[PDB]
């Protein structure tokens, strides 16, 4: 076997392992936050954009991770290190 | 006490409606028995 079809084989095992965790953790911590800011709606109708605020600090902590991720996916895939 | 019932942010409740209903309603009697009693103190005087 090319050691090359090994090499590429793990990197694409391991940017599916790094994109599945990347998407569970942005859905989970979106969809906690959003349920944060509907109930907060709920409660108070007025209240909405003082909470967009700390909402969409959330929101760019958990996407910026997840994103995080791809670079790190394509680097696994496109520009895979130890590729000989 | 009978119900009298009116057409027209929710406020919150701690720890619950229920409770903080039954701990109000006797209040509420007091205070309606303590207006009797100084209704009857001014009418007396």
Same mark, same amino acid.
């Given at each position: 076997?090319?050691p090359?079809? %090994?090499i590429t084989?793990?990197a694409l095992?391991? !940017?599916? =392992?790094?994109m599945?965790?990347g998407?569970?953790?942005?859905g %989970?911590?979106? !969809?906690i936050?959003?349920?944060?800011l509907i +109930?907060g709606i709920?409660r108070? /109708?007025?209240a909405?954009?003082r909470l $967009?605020? /700390?909402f *969409? %600090?959330?929101?760019? #902590?958990?996407?910026?991770? &997840?994103?995080?991720? =791809?670079?790190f @996916?394509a680097?696994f895939? $496109?520009?895979?290190?130890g590729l000989? | @006490?009978?119900?009298?019932?009116?057409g027209?942010?929710?406020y +919150? $409740?701690? /720890?619950? /409606?229920?409770?903080? *209903?039954?701990?109000? #309603?006797?209040? &509420? %009697?007091?205070?309606?028995? &303590?207006?009797?009693l100084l209704?009857?103190?001014?009418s007396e005087?």
């Amino acid at each position: 076997l090319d050691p090359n079809a %090994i090499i590429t084989a793990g990197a694409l095992i391991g !940017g599916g =392992l790094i994109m599945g965790g990347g998407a569970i953790g942005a859905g %989970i911590g979106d !969809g906690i936050a959003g349920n944060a800011l509907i +109930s907060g709606i709920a409660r108070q /109708p007025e209240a909405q954009g003082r909470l $967009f605020t /700390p909402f *969409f %600090i959330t929101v760019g #902590l958990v996407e910026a991770a &997840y994103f995080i991720n =791809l670079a790190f @996916m394509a680097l696994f895939v $496109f520009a895979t290190p130890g590729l000989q | @006490m009978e119900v009298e019932y009116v057409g027209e942010t929710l406020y +919150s $409740f701690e /720890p619950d /409606p229920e409770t903080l *209903f039954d701990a109000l #309603l006797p209040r &509420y %009697i007091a205070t309606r028995v &303590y207006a009797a009693l100084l209704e009857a103190a001014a009418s007396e005087s």
